[PDB]
Design a binder for these strands. Structure first.
Length: 91
RNA sequence: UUGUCCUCCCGGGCAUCGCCGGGCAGCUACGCCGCAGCCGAUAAGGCCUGAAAGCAUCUAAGGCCGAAGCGGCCCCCGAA
């Protein structure tokens, strides 16, 4: 193990609601609703106060990478529901 | 139509079906008719999101495409 435990926290804005049903995370915002399943053995996702917490006991290198990836994905979903995404292409 | 024999005519036997020309049915080819490009998952490869490693990154988790190649549609055998 690389550490005793790993805990990643993602803030929830005022207008956004995040719920967890087992291994599935649903984020509802002003601009829409998103749902995604983040599953990894030993990794638990919940909500505390105003943050989403991804937690694991005695993680390894791969476990830390997975936890950071899940946190990034949840942050992306929150950003998308709060303001959305735009891509530009040129002909 | 040739040689021979049945005496000659007619009509017949044998000589590779005697030889030659044509020849329907049948069998045949040199003859004629018929043989789908769509769906699904993939290899090489081209990408999206994304951390390990505050950046970057097609890869570690995840996702979309992508072969005369694989599976199905099709055909033949098939209640021991």
């Amino acid at each position: 193990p690389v550490d005793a435990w790993i805990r990643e926290e993602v803030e929830i804005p005022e207008g956004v609601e995040v719920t967890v049903e087992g291994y599935k995370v649903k984020v509802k915002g002003p601009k829409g609703e998103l749902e995604r399943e983040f599953f990894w053995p030993g990794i638990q996702i919940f909500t505390e106060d105003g943050n989403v917490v991804i937690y694991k006991d005695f993680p390894r290198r791969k476990d830390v990478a997975i936890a950071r990836t899940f946190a990034a994905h949840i942050r992306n979903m929150i950003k998308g529901v709060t303001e959305g995404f735009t891509y530009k292409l040129k002909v």
